[PDB]
């Protein structure tokens, strides 16, 4: 394998949502914007919109379920986010069960809980440092101001235009 990647930014360039409220952040979020160093715009087959459901457990970790529409079926990816060093920061639960994955970091950058959210991800897989940013939406659509702000923040982490994508809304699986 030979492969080139845009460097993961320093954590100082990734803000943290102040006084993060885990209870208010639960529920379904739509992925209305997706950016990252391993993410690429594919004009021939545009990425379809997928959803991620956060649900607080008793021990204050999240059962994180992502649901996407792939190959005419609904695929479900169930993961666990364990609370990290500061509120709004999380590490991946049961990391040993994922082969190659030596590191995983989640950081809630900004959110108003009832409309939108921005979450930063960083992961070292096979000694390759990947990072991504997701524009979460409570509905499938969001304003141009929020979308241009997501593009602005994505660029501030060294990501060009073609590494920023906006998944097209769909009705399959991500509703209900
Ligand atoms: Na990632």
Q: Would you give an account of this structure?
A:
The protein contains one helix and nine strands. It is mainly β. The chain has one domain: Beta Barrel (Lipocalin). Strands 1-2-3-4-5-6-7-8 form an eight-stranded antiparallel beta barrel. A hairpin with a 4-residue loop joins strand 6 and strand 7. The termini are far apart. It binds sodium ion. Monomer. Homodimer; disulfide-linked. Heterodimer; disulfide-linked with MMP9. Keywords: Apoptosis, Cytoplasmic vesicle, Disulfide bond, Glycoprotein, Immunity, Innate immunity, Ion transport, Iron, Iron transport, Pyrrolidone carboxylic acid, Secreted, Signal, Transport. It holds the Pfam family Lipocalin. Its main location: secreted.
Helices and strands in order:
Blueprint (H helix, E strand, L loop, with lengths): L26 E10 L14 E6 L5 E9 L2 E11 L5 E4 L8 E11 L4 E10 L2 E10 L6 H13 L7 E2 L11
Antiparallel strand pairs: 1-2, 1-8, 1-9, 2-3, 3-4, 4-5, 5-6, 6-7, 7-8
Bound molecules: sodium ion.
Sodium ion binds next to β7 and β8.
Number of helices: 1
Q: What best-fitting shape do the alpha-carbon axes yield?
A: globular
Distance between the termini: 41 Å
H and E string:
EEEEEEEEHE
In total, how many beta strands?
9
Distinct compounds present: sodium ion
InterPro entries: Calycin (IPR012674), LCN2/LCN12 (IPR003087), Lipocalin (IPR002345), Lipocalin_CS (IPR022272), Lipocln_cytosolic_FA-bd_dom (IPR000566)
Family: Belongs to the calycin superfamily. Lipocalin family.
Protein name: Neutrophil gelatinase-associated lipocalin
Glycosylation sites: 63
């Amino acid at each position: 394998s030979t492969s080139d990647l845009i460097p993961a930014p320093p954590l100082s360039k990734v803000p943290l949502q102040q006084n993060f409220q885990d209870n208010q952040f639960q529920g379904k979020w739509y992925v209305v914007g997706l950016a990252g160093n391993a993410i690429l715009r594919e004009d021939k087959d545009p990425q379809k919109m997928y959803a991620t459901i956060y649900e607080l457990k008793e021990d204050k970790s999240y059962n994180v379920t992502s649901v996407l529409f792939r190959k005419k079926k609904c695929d479900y990816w169930i993961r666990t986010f364990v609370p990290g060093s500061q509120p709004g920061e999380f590490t991946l639960g049961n990391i040993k069960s994922y082969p190659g994955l030596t590191s995983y970091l989640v950081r809630v950058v900004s959110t108003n809980y009832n409309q939108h959210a921005m979450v930063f991800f960083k992961a070292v897989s096979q000694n390759r440092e990947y990072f991504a940013i997701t524009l979460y939406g409570r509905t499938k659509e969001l304003t141009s101001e929020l979308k241009e702000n997501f593009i602005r923040f994505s660029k501030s982490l060294g990501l060009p235009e073609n590494h920023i994508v906006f998944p097209v809304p769909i009705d399959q699986c991500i509703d209900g």
